[PDB]
Design a protein around this motif. Sequence first.
Motif, PDB file in Angstrom:
ATOM      1  N   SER A  98       4.401   6.317  -5.193  1.00 57.68           N
ATOM      2  CA  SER A  98       4.629   5.598  -4.149  1.00 57.68           C
ATOM      3  C   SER A  98       3.509   4.384  -4.222  1.00 57.68           C
ATOM      4  N   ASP A 205       1.606   6.625   3.125  1.00 62.41           N
ATOM      5  CA  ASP A 205       2.890   6.625   2.201  1.00 62.41           C
ATOM      6  C   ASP A 205       3.598   7.809   2.362  1.00 62.41           C
ATOM      7  N   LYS A 208       5.348   7.889   5.748  1.00 59.80           N
ATOM      8  CA  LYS A 208       6.517   7.065   5.789  1.00 59.80           C
ATOM      9  C   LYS A 208       7.437   7.210   4.837  1.00 59.80           C
ATOM     10  N   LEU A 210       7.788   6.957   1.213  1.00 59.99           N
ATOM     11  CA  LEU A 210       7.665   5.959   0.233  1.00 59.99           C
ATOM     12  C   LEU A 210       7.551   6.380  -1.003  1.00 59.99           C
TER      13      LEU A 210
END
Length: 210
Positions: A98, A205, A208, A210
């Motif tokens: 990420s 991250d 989220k 990612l």
Amino acid sequence: AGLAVELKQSTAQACEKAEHSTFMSDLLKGRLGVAEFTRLQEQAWLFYTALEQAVDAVRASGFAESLLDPALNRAEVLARDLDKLNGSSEWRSRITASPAVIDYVNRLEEIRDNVDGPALVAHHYVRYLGDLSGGQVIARMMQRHYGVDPEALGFYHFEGIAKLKVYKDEYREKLNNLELSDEQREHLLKEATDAFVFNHQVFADLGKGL
Ligand code: COH
């Protein structure tokens, strides 16, 4: 006055903010699962690899030698845990970083290539002491909520370290015994807050996706 204390007081704010991440809240409170936690350990293996390269480079320079305990190495044990967590070693052929992990890795390589001893000790303190502390709580909640095999959690168990309380006390003593200039001491204290910010965005991250 007292590096271990001055470190614990300077980062006490960010440490409390580190337990409150959305990803780490859902993970410990039983809302995620083995899949999301395996994603955490895959990013961990990435920056723990970059960290221990910096540890090896600083240790070879003779800086904080007694503190950089090889028994703290986590990258290989993580690889052994990811084999079990993924049920196959084919995770190595598809790991992705990420953005925040890439940003975390770039700084650890910067510390490695500069052989930045004091900045290394900051990252050494933030990760390993957290593993020896909150990681024990994270390891338990993994078994309690998700029934993860206790041998796929070897990252949170330290085979060289029997008495964790004694070792964490021994670690803080070596912190207080470090011979640092005032320039080095401030550089270390600043990087420690930086190290928590690096980790906080790693967990941002994760939450989220990612
Ligand atoms: C669920 C609880 C929990 C979580 C999620 C957590 C997540 C993290 C985390 C993830 C981003 C990082 C980098 C850290 C980093 C640390 N933790 Co925690 N910790 C946690 C519970 C603790 C506990 C308990 C201690 C013992 C000392 C204290 O201040 O609470 C702790 C201590 C530490 C220390 C040592 C402080 C000192 O004695 O100087 C560091 C460094 N940490 N921790």
